[PDB]
A paper describes a structure:
To test this hypothesis, we studied the orientation distribution of GDH in a cryo-vitrified specimen using the HFBI film and explored whether its distribution can be regulated by pH. We found that the orientation distributions of GDH changed at different pH conditions from 5.5 to 8.5. Finally 162,042 (48,499 for side views), 120,274 (14,013 for side views), 149,320 (37,812 for side views), 120,149 (73,256 for side views), 82,340 (52,545 for side views), 88,585 (60,808 for side views), 174,836 (126,218 for side views) particles were selected. Under acidic conditions, GDH particles mainly showed top (“triangle-like” appearance) and tilt views, while under basic conditions, GDH particles mainly showed side views (“worm-like” appearance). We found that without the support of HFBI film, GDH always shows a dominant top view regardless of the pH conditions, which is significantly different from our observation using the support of HFBI film. With HFBI film as a support, we collected a large cryo-EM dataset of GDH at pH 7.5, which is close to its isoelectric point (pH 7.66). At this pH, GDH particles exhibited the most even distribution. After several steps of single-particle analysis, we obtained the cryo-EM map of GDH at a resolution of 2.26 Å according to the gold standard threshold FSC0.143. The cryo-EF analysis of this dataset gave a factor of 0.84, indicating no strong preferential orientation problem. We also calculated the Rosenthal–Henderson B-factor of this dataset as 76.0 Å2, again suggesting a high-quality cryo-EM dataset. We found that the contact site in the top view is highly positively charged at pH 5.5 and becomes less charged with increasing pH, whereas the contact site in the side view is less charged at pH 5.5 but becomes highly negatively charged at pH 8.5.
Author numbering:
A (entry chain A), B (entry chain B), C (entry chain E): 6 to 501
The structure:
């Protein structure tokens, strides 16, 4: 199993090698062909590595009164778009290479979904299970101070985000620390971090963001007859099964949104075991059973499945757990028609090459796992705007809709002759429910769906334009590299 | 031919002399009548001249290794609204008087279209044809640095713009230089300049901005029966001909948008000759013929017209070329019913006085040439917002429209008794095309049209309120002076 | 040969282990003995590692038009005193571990000479011999920009300095870049870097700074009878010989200043060979011979010495060349009574342990190589003051001295009875020369000598207080650790 750094390097190298010929041809400036070739190679060389990596060593005082030195890292991959964006991970396994690779991955993911952020990633080398709430808060605030002093945290410079190991309370601590010490005179101080709770400037709909993004990315390619023909399927969600690996937030919400639109789930596996029921599994039953039992084992409405969760006889495989689980050990045995990677880097390059032969579709995490990033961009915009979405427009649009219905009613009675005849003033039950429960999360989900659809169409266009098959990962990486190169080329690189 | 400085001074003097009587009467504060008269005279005296003019002399190193001293100027006319806005012109003919006059013109143009910018203008005394791309970039970056150090460039202070002689690449250089050296810690650094390419924070629809503004300003007065009666015409665009002077971006886009709405073009003239075809000229044919041939001469579908392009037997004359082309030499020979000035100051005051006698309508460049300024304001707002227009609302409004259509369908079947009867769920072909191709440029063009309509109505109201005839220039200048005086008076002038 | 990182770690560990018992005892606050022990251990643990390490990857455009990615690092060891201070090294061999070790060494060196700077070190992974002047300037300016954006360059944050591989022109480039882009609004922008040329705010006397510091550190221990007894010598500089390893700036100036005060040199060795003359070698002859011949080989007034320069039958060995040249391979053969380390880390710990047995004095580079740091502190102070030393006081003190002499003359004639008798108005030839040639370098050298004397006395006091013998390195490290601990303890560490 190659490391994520080498994986990202290989993906970028392949994408750049594919895209360079077009990058050279589209240049129409007053130089020679070989000068254009060298310029394109040079800009790619500039883009590939991380620009800034900061290693930190700061002290904290333990609860008992002892002192501990904490090691932390933050890598900013690209500054072609500011601010940089990236999560903070609290783990003993964090490393400079890992944070650099994840920062590069974030850079390329933001480009795919047209989010104007650079890539970043931070890691603190602690095990949070061995610290109290007070000590964790002290660590978070000291990390925030040290990063802010060196220009690695800021609303216009670098906006961190939560991870699996960090949460909304950590983001609250970061925002509170920045807004009160370093960014006190900055009106956008609370835009320095996303993933905040609602009372701290968070955005509505962030909880189901990644799951909804996974669902939208799945459905965009599901409703595509051109790819459905090669995969041997039918358009729509009918007669389709899916399984999820890991039942975290991403997997749970993806399962719920897939079950909503008519798809049925078969089995749900984790590291502590796996459930299995071919007739359909209810996401709410799984949710409340897990909420009570602390685990998924012992579900009375399903049974135990032997072997890995990746080899079930299903249609769509959705891994939302530990990464690099798809490799040559189990790649030729999965027998899953579509692979929907809800996690970052769950498929090795050799596994992907195997799936290419077997006509197996792999939807890259560059595109599918970008819903949370889009909603974080929306939250950052909301903090910049200092108002929630729809606050000044919901009642106005409601009045406009009522006026439109009234106009239709009067016109219908006036073509006729009536006073109380045809009544096209009644909105449908779904429309009335939408009107009554109109909130910021509706706008957020609408924007997320729009972003997912646009990105899917761009990826498809790139795939057909470069004669690519079912390897959507190559098309997505090519698209991201093209966008980043365009920004670099039309801006200039050196000011000296 | 009087200089543009004297022309602007005369326009302002006439407008102030007309508007002063009303400016005095509407004042309802606790002073005397003569004190009010003196206060109004005083505020007009304050408004008339430019506030700040900066003369620059900075060095560059040539490609061969020699050094050259570059002279540049930037004039900020008014600071009653910040930031100031104005273009940068690369020409040997630039001068302090010219940049001051153009800054004043920009101040008065922004007021007409309700754009909250002061007026500004910059000029660099070089001939860009005698420099390479590298040397031009060095000149642009050094000019940006020198202006930024003295508070003459900034998102909240002064936002430059392109001209005919400068372009999107120059704006890219300016934005890149400012965002990396002086405005590095400013979150709105890229709002320091407009006219940027799309990848650098530019706005969609800027290319056709001035042409669309010219078309909207023409159609606003075309659809006005009160003025059509005095001009002896019919409302609408039927049985109307137009010719353009110069086939630049402004003239080309104005011709295209006029041809779209049913108007027919007769002849297109430039400095290298003129084409002529009374039966109709196709803008796309002209566009691609010019793109291939580098000029307009030799068009197989039309013939040569002798004499100046300003004396054709047409209905609407649209000069979009060098200025001061309408003067006593050719004023009584033009025989064009309406003059639509798409360029800055193409008519001399004596020519305008001649057109007043001959019942010839002159639409001022203060109003007609303000589409680019409005779209630049939109681009500045987009940079401040850090998101493109419609990103969070397109899908939401699409869902709302579908729900409205569904409500109408169900209500129609329910007044009736049907399940699949009347089907008012189908949007029209034009509506469906608008829904499918909904983008930021649609919002930009909608805002531009709204601004043009509001400005046209305000100008008409001022014209009828001050007993003015077809001299819309006087009405527009009076309106701008009134707005600027209102801002000055309600704010106060001296803080000491 | 262990690496410099492990060497510094071992030196710090030994010093902390020696000093901890006293650090605990002198604490008189309201806690328990074991709490004091843990607090001291904890502060030492905080002090030991580097606080911030920044890894950079920035592009430059080559002269031929190609692009290259440059890797650079800057490590800030301690922020207990701001700004941090450290040199910039242009070499292919630079590494994160090396820059961290050198930053720690700088932290401990500044404490010894009471210079209020933290330690820092920067390295750029290029070979300057393979670049032109223009490319080197581009690299320097881009490095300055990248460091300044991340808070790693600044008059109050971090002040870089030259190295052997970087020079006054590089410091000029750094100062010019910072003062014009990021620190434009900072009145102390030119204090961001030291080692500048005179016309750029440099200080007089920097050239001979390190050599004069080496001479002063040597003479302080030479004039100490208490150590002279154990070494079996006589106080003064009579009947004393010295040899230098490497004839760089440090070695040349140390040789010149030692020859001035009556000491005689025997041989001068480098990597290209070695000269040898037991009867005395003239520093000016060596200087101009090297200036003409580009090397030291072929000196007509001396002969070739076989073997290493470290094993000559002399009294004082002064290495001013590559580091780690003293080790077990040649340690028991040197036969040099006193070792005066003018270079950073030229003696390995095993070599030092060997010299301890053989009653061989080793003067640490922590103290002896700190003259340049002191003069850099003086230059930083001069830039902050915006005036050269003595500008407002030289003439005043000259008038005061003349008045004192006149007072003595009149009093002598008035005790006597005379008008033109005793004439104590004539200053000596040396005093008159000092008065006539009074400049800033005299004040700089006076301050350097004062700093060296104070540091030597403090080191001696620590050595006798901790029962240390001739291992002055341990005493110096103990003194630096004590000072840093005092600052940390009396300030506090965590603000949370």
């Amino acid at each position: 199993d190659p490391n994520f750094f080498k994986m990202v390097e290989g993906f970028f190298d392949r994408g750049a090698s594919i895209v360079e010929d077009k990058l050279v041809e589209d240049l129409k400036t007053r130089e020679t062909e070989e000068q254009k070739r060298n310029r394109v190679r040079s800009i790619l060389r500039i883009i590939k590595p991380c620009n800034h990596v900061l290693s930190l060593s700061f002290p904290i005082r333990r609860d008992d009164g002892s002192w501990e030195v904490i090691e932390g890292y933050r890598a900013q991959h690209s500054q072609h778009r500011t601010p940089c964006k990236g999560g903070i991970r609290y783990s003993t396994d964090v490393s400079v290479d890992e944070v650099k690779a994840l920062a590069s991955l974030m850079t390329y993911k933001c480009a795919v979904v047209d989010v104007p952020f650079g890539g970043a990633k931070a890691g603190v080398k602690i095990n949070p299970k061995n610290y109290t709430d007070n000590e964790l808060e002290k660590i978070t605030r000291r990390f925030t101070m040290e990063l802010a002093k060196k220009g690695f945290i800021g609303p216009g410079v670098d906006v961190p985000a939560p991870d699996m190991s960090t949460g909304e309370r950590e983001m609250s601590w970061i925002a509170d620390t920045y807004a009160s010490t370093i960014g006190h005179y900055d009106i956008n101080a609370h835009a320095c971090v996303t993933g905040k709770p609602i009372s701290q400037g968070g955005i509505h709909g962030r909880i189901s963001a990644t799951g909804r993004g996974v669902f939208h990315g799945i459905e965009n390619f599901i409703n595509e007859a051109s790819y459905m023909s090669i995969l041997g399927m039918t358009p729509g969600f009918g007669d389709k099964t899916f399984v999820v690996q890991g039942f975290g937030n991403v997997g749970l919400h993806s399962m719920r949104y897939l079950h909503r639109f008519g798809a049925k789930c078969i089995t749900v596996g984790e590291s502590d075991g796996s459930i299995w029921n071919p007739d359909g599994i209810d996401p709410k039953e799984l949710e409340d059973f897990k909420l009570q039992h602390g685990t998924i084992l012992g579900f009375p409405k399903a049974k135990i499945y032997e072997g890995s969760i990746l080899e079930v006889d299903c249609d769509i495989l959705i891994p939302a757990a530990s990464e690099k689980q798809l490799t040559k050990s189990n790649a030729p045995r999965v027998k899953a028609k579509i692979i929907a990677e809800g996690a970052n880097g769950p498929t090795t390059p050799e596994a992907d090459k195997i799936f290419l032969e077997r006509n197996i579709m792999v939807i890259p995490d560059l595109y599918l796992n970008a819903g949370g990033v889009t909603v974080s961009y929306f939250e950052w915009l909301k903090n910049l705007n200092h108002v929630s979405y729809g606050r000044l427009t919901f009642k106005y649009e409601r009045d406009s809709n009522y006026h439109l219905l009234m106009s239709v009613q009067e016109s219908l009675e006036r073509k006729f002759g009536k006073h109380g005849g045809t009544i096209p003033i009644v909105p449908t039950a779904e429309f009335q429910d939408r009107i009554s429960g109109a909130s910021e999360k509706d706008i957020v989900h609408s924007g997320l769906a729009y972003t997912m659809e646009r990105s899917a169409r761009q990826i498809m266009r790139t795939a057909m334009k470069y004669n690519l098959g079912l390897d959507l990962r190559t098309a997505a990486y090519v698209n991201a590299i093209e966008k980043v190169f365009r920004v670099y080329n039309e801006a200039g690189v050196t000011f000296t």
